[PDB]
Paper text:
In S. cerevisiae meiosis I, sister kinetochores are fused through the action of the kinetochore-binding monopolin complex, and together bind a single microtubule. The conserved core of the monopolin complex comprises two nucleolar proteins, Csm1 and Lrs4. These proteins form a distinctive V-shaped complex, with two Csm1 homodimers bridged at their coiled-coil N-termini by a pair of Lrs4 subunits, thereby positioning two pairs of Csm1 globular-domain “heads” ~ 10 nm apart at the apices of the V. Each Csm1 globular domain has a conserved hydrophobic cavity implicated in binding the kinetochore protein Dsn1, leading to the proposal that monopolin could bridge Dsn1 molecules from sister kinetochores to physically fuse the kinetochores. A ~ 40-residue region within the disordered N-terminus of the core kinetochore protein, Dsn1, has been identified as the kinetochore receptor for the monopolin subunit Csm1.
Dsn1 Box 3 contains two serine residues (Sc Dsn1 S109 and S110) that are highly conserved throughout budding yeast. The high conservation and physical proximity of these serine residues to positively charged residues on Csm1 suggests that these residues may become phosphorylated, and that phosphorylation could reinforce the observed binding mode between Dsn1 Box 2-3 and Csm1. Indeed, mass spectrometry of Dsn1 purified from metaphase I-arrested cells showed that S109 and S110 are phosphorylated in vivo. Further supporting this idea, we could reconstitute a complex of Cg Csm169–181 and a minimised Cg Dsn1 Box 2-3 construct (residues 43–67) with both S66 and S67 (equivalent to Sc Dsn1 S109 and S110) mutated to aspartate to mimic phosphorylation (referred to as Cg Csm169–181:Dsn143-67DD). We determined a 1.8 Å-resolution structure of this complex, which closely agrees with both structures described above with the addition of a specific interaction between Dsn1 residue D66 and Csm1 K172. Consistent with the idea that phosphorylation of Dsn1 Box 3 promotes Csm1 binding, we found that Sc Dsn171–110 with the phosphomimetic S109D/S110D mutation showed increased binding to Sc Csm169–190 in vitro. A recent study has shown that Dsn1 Box 1 is dispensable for binding to Csm1 as measured by yeast two-hybrid assay, and our own biochemical reconstitutions reveal that the Box 2-3 region alone binds stably to Csm1, at least when the conserved Box 3 serine residues are mutated to aspartate. We hypothesise that sister kinetochore binding by the two Csm1 heads could trigger a switch in interaction mode between Box 1 and Box 2-3, with further stabilisation of the Box 2-3 interaction coming through phosphorylation of the two conserved serine residues in Box 3 (Sc Dsn1 S109 and S110).
Residue numbers in the entry:
A (entry chain A): 68 to 118, 125 to 179
B (entry chain B): 40 to 67
């Protein structure tokens, strides 16, 4: 249906990506994701938001789900900005997925 | 797709409001 739906459906089948919970509200289409292999796992939520209409991706790191030791390992491997909530244009979603995937494999 | 909970609806708005914009991810 919506471009957003199409993008989500493909995102859920990316290598190394496991989508758990999905919802749609007024702001857009949101889903919880686990990414990464044995080396490291990161949980995060993506939002595909539409609000003359604007589209953006919201990235929310889910750190509460980690143990302290897992968080310490992740903080060595990933850039500081992946421990904060981010917005970025859809055209950067590929760059985001590649950065996350490479950072977890390091 | 699925109907949102109160927490999910709150979370969406809080996360949109507090998000830091980044244009791209790359190293030179």
């Amino acid at each position: 249906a919506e471009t957003i739906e199409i993008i989500k459906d493909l995102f859920e089948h990316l290598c190394g990506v496991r989508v758990h919970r999905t919802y749609e509200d007024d702001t857009g289409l949101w889903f919880d994701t686990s990414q990464g292999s044995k080396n490291g796992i990161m949980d995060y939520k993506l939002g595909f938001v539409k609000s003359e209409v604007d589209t953006e991706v919201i990235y929310v790191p889910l750190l509460k789900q980690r143990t302290a030791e897992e968080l310490q390992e992740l903080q060595k491997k990933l850039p500081d900005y992946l421990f904060e909530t981010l917005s970025f244009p859809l055209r950067s979603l590929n760059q985001f997925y590649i950065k996350m995937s490479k950072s977890l494999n390091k | 797709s699925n109907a949102p909970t109160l927490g999910e609806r709150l979370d969406s708005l809080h996360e949109i409001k507090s998000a830091r914009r980044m244009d791209h991810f790359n190293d030179d």
